[model samples]
Target chain A: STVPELLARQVTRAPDAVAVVDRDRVLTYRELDELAGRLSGRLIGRGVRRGDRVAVLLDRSADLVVTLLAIWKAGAAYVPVDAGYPAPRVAFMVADSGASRMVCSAATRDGVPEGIEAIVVTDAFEASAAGARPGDLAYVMYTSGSTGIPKGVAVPHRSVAELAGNPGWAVEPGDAVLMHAPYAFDASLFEIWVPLVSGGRVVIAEPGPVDARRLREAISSGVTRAHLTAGSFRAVAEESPESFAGLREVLTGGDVVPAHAVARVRSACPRVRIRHLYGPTETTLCATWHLLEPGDEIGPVLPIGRPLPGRRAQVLDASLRAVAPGVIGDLYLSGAGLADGYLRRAGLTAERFVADPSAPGARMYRTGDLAQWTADGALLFAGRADD
Target chain B: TNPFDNEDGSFLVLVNGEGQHSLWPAFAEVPDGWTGVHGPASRQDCLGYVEQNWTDLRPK
Candidate 1:
């Protein structure tokens, strides 16, 4: 229903608007929707039923975008294995997730291991395709573990909608956002859906890793928003602050933002909004957001920010009692955005998904993060209370 | 660098003024020109030993 909602809304509001751009190639909302419809039909013809686990081992680009929507439209869950990961890692995810089918481009398909059924998206698209309804699993992303194996994180459509419709970070129409993160990473989820649903333009950089120089050029060339990690932010902030002069907002996360780094960016791009975001993939994107405000002491703040729209956060002790303000305890998140749990790991689900002690019929996902309630009601992150 | 006597009489790496080090074995089958000597007991002993035996052990 949500996919249709976005598709319908875009078609009605601005069918001609450019929905995605990839180095000289562009797809307006209407065209993109049409392409997804065709791809979805083809998937259905190929026996991809609703809720079927499908894998997509491709890099970040227009092809990835089409495959993503097609899977959603086919009512199948698309598992994304990072192209940067080793082939064995990708094969492990493919086997672990029990994905029966995969979609990839010719170049990327070279690395996909054998044993899983797959279709070349470019070839599949050349033929006619069909459409899918709502109430389907959207995608699954594999997180690379330190042990060298990967875990498949299944995300359904409702959770995706929770992330897409979270209105906390308002993305306006005609907003041109620079798409940078690789297709393998969760950040790409934001880079794609956030703009597409909001009727904004998504600009994809050419093939290869995006360095500071490319980011600088993209920022100055009229891209309004871009996501950055703390390290990348520091490099760009020091290299050429003026390069980001035209951006309206630069969201930085994945690590702590030093006060000096925040100050430098603030001083350099006076007009751009610098947001320090904190969240894990399990939360369906992010749980908290902190927009750096002038005159406020910058650096690391414990409470990342208040719960985003439709999301709820609570601090509890070992016994599950609600901790009072200033008391540190485990931070648990409960809301519509909670993922369906790790793919095929029932024991982990049992451990992570606990009964909501405070509320009847509610379940809370233990974030494993420590935090204390601030006097001002903001959740201040303490540290890893569990570790 | 501290140089204590090896309980097993094994090899040891010793350093000089420039922070460089040399590994000398008390008993091992190395090439002919390599030095093999008992230490003056401490780090200063190793340095002094190498200093005193500098040219005498040459491969002439």
Candidate 2:
């Protein structure tokens, strides 16, 4: 089943349960599913076809939810450009993704240049929609590159499915997942799809202007789990330890979770589990996971744990041969979790996604990360070993 | 309740008025239209000067 089908199943199983809460507004599973279905129809009527790219310029709100799911359901890829971004950046992304159409709220439609018709997310637009397939490309996200221009990562249905099914990171039914990160970030995909696919609820959290009072109120309102950046995690640990008491699991990524801070948090919050997740966007969210248990010896540096379930990670020498244990080499990831390839850049795709010599047709993404394997086969992340 | 009262002689402070119009001095030590400008002042004078100039100062 596809992502849209998974959401529909949740709606059928638990229609009355709250599926999404945006500040004061709440959408039940049934409400969210039906709205997405209607929006999908609208997108098809607006000329979106299977494999066609539709840019979605929206902030984190119900509109974002409906547009994303609808994009996937309509068999068209949704190119998500953060509305918070500068107009030039958004326009560049739109041009790069080759999106013929766009989906946006009325408030954001002005940002797009004139001439490109954007399907407004209000009731008016939904009323006009006609419905389209689960087999289409879900969306394309662009990550900044060192060479000025941003690189567009085109993720299809298969990549998204692999991400939703990967083990070691599961969102059970009734679990409340907080959407705190920017949509532009690849990590944000997990925050969006994990709970949606698992029959859980997604809680929208305002990212900037994060004050102590507002954070306390949000946490008290039933946010069981949240993904925190290392900086935010450190701030909470230092300022409002009490605010994080109700949190069941806090996954820290985007930077190394310092050992001292991790130890302190683990000691203070006996109830909360601190997990260190490591991966790049190209790898479909995460590849390795390390859980910091009480009394676990954490050093100045933390390793990006072993390969997660259903994923294979290896450190290979320049010639693609597996390096000896404890020897540093480029980290290569091969599994169902790998993304299809970079969007519209075949040369770069060929350079990064190399055919695994061991497995004929299977490919491994050169993570550009330097790492070493422990004697126990656990992978330890070293610095970037090569340019 | 005397509006102008500070035990310390450092009480007399000069402040700026809105729209860069003029300077207003606090404490009853002297004359009207007397800008009571100082080349260098104490911490209180500096703070009062900043408070007075707030309206006139534009953020870069």
Candidate 3:
């Protein structure tokens, strides 16, 4: 099932349940659904069709979440434009994606490029009845490229469905998950949809610089789950270990997971489940996960662990042959979670995404990252193999 | 004008088709769809040039 279908199921299960919480407003599942549906209606009226890319220029807020859902509901994929980016960069992204329509707020309206239609989100609109299919495009995330420009990675609905439906971490119904990562980052996938699909509430922390105090306030306000990058996690784990006391689970990764940081969190909040997640934007949200236990001695480098359900990973040499268990090779990921490919870059996509040697008819993402399997079968991440 | 001068940090002010200005390194090749409008000046001077010239921030 697609993300919208999963959300529909949750709305039916508990319409009155709090779906999202911000400083200004608290939205129940039914209310959030209705607001998104209204925005979708407006987008559809503006000629947004299936597979069309719509630029979303908004700050980190409940409105951003609403706009994402609305874009999907209108059968269009959203291209997130970071509010912090310079006007020229933002304009380039909007034009590069070929997005003819944009959804923006007062703060971000000036960033929308020329020749594209703009819709102010604060205006009232009717709800849309249109919807998307499971195989349709979901969102396009741009990553900084080695060539100085950014390349857009187009992710589909099925990948998100797989990630949210079968999460590696334990996310119970009604759990309060913190939405901390910006929409431009892949971590936002877990922060927003993981909770929405599992009948959990999304507690959106205020946007800006994330310090220990803001994290502490979110946890103190009953946020049970959060996904932080390694840098942010270290800042919180070291600056205020007491903030993690109330969290049930905290997932961290992006950069290498420092063993010392993991050890500190394990010792400070013995009860909190610390999961180390690893993946590239090309493979959707995540490809591998490791749940660190109390007293677990993480060595110099932490293991990226095994692949999530419906996904497969293999370390192969330059010839595309699987290497020996202890041999280091390029890590290739394949499965339902793999993204379609880079947008409008056929040659680059062909070079990176190749047919899996072992599994016929299946393509694997050649993650430039190097890794090797330990004797016990866990995957240990090495440094990047390419520039 | 020496593009390698690091004392004041020389830069190239590039303008896109939409009239949006971007500060790029003077040493690098100007990207496609953009032309060097002002150049070989200090970073601040280039920024000031863009601020004065790029009145309409909208793209073409």
Clash count list over all predictions:
10, 4, 2
lDDT per residue as tens, model 1, A46-131? 88887787888776777778888888777777788776778878788888877888887887778677877768876834434333
Docking class of 2: incorrect
Note the residue pairs that clash in candidate 1. A38-A129, A41-A129, A41-A130, A42-A129, A42-A130, A302-A380, A302-A381, A303-A379, A303-A380, A303-A381
Considering every candidate listed, which one attains the maximal lDDT?
3
Taking the tens digit of each residue's C-alpha lDDT, what string does model 2 give over A1-387?
Answer: 356666667778878888888988899888887788788878777777777788887878876887887777677777887788887787788888888788888788887745567787874345332233433456677865434567877665666766765556667876788886777777776787878778778888875644446656766887777887878877776776666666777777766566777766766777777788888777767878887664455666666887777778877665456789989888888876665556656435544654454543455677777889889887777765333
Tell me how far the alpha carbon of residue A277 in candidate 1 is from the true structure, in angstroms, after superposition.
1.8
Superposed model 2: Cα runs more than 4 Å off: A123-135, A145-148, A207-213, A238-242, A293-300, B1-60
Clashing residue pairs for model 3? B18-B59, B18-B60
Those runs of model 1 whose alpha carbons end farther than 4 Å from true positions after fitting are A124-135, A144-149, A293-303, B1-60
Candidate 2 residue pairs in backbone clash? A41-A130, A41-A131, A42-A129, B16-B52
lDDT of each: 0.68, 0.67, 0.79
Misplaced by over 4 Å in model 3 are A145-147, A294-300, B1-60
User: Lowest summed lDDT over 10 consecutive residues: which window, candidate 3 chain A?
Assistant: A346-355
How does model 3 score by TM-score? 0.84
Docking band of candidate 1: incorrect
Which 10-residue window of candidate 2 chain A scores lowest in summed lDDT? A127-136
Per-model chain B TM-scores are 0.33, 0.29, 0.77
What's the chain B TM-score of candidate 3? Answer: 0.77
